[PDB]
Design a protein around this ligand. Structure first.
Ligand SMILES: NC(=O)C[C@@H]1NC(=O)C2(CCCCC2)NC(=O)C[C@@H](c2ccc(CP(=O)(O)O)cc2)/C=C/C[C@@H](Cc2cccc3ccccc23)CNC1=O
Length: 100
């Protein structure tokens, strides 16, 4: 669900292209090392949530924090995340791997 340097636009397409509802995708800055931004699809609008961190790598949003980003996507994948409806983080179909 992680993506290197990609414009908010590209992300919206990655989620929309999906079939389920609640596709999440975390993108990282280009020259901003240590930055993380989650992009989830909600209906006909692609929302997002700026991810923060403190100490060293530990990230968080409001009152929840973890060591790795994986703990965030998971925690929210089972526990509510939106402050409007009841939706979870759906595992996005990361880029396909077609080896030779
Ligand atoms: N942490 C969160 O994501 C929750 C919350 N965000 C929101 O309420 C919403 C959620 C989706 C629906 C509208 C409201 N989003 C925003 O304010 C936008 C968010 C954001 C995230 C990712 C990107 C990357 P992009 O430009 O490539 O799309 C741009 C903006 C931009 C978020 C920046 C926040 C300001 C902020 C800046 C730096 C450090 C912070 C530390 C703690 C709290 C806020 C901080 C203010 N907003 C929020 O804290």
């Amino acid at each position: 669900w992680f993506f290197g340097k990609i414009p908010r636009a590209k992300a919206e397409e990655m989620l929309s292209k999906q079939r389920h509802d609640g596709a999440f995708l975390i993108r990282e800055s280009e020259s901003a090392p240590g930055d993380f931004s989650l992009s989830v699809k909600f209906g006909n609008d692609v929302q997002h949530f700026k991810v923060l961190r403190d100490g060293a790598g530990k990230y968080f949003l409001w009152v929840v924090k973890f060591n790795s980003l994986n703990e965030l996507v998971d925690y929210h994948r089972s526990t509510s995340v939106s402050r409007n409806q009841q939706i979870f983080l759906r595992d996005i179909e990361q880029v396909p791997q077609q080896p030779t």
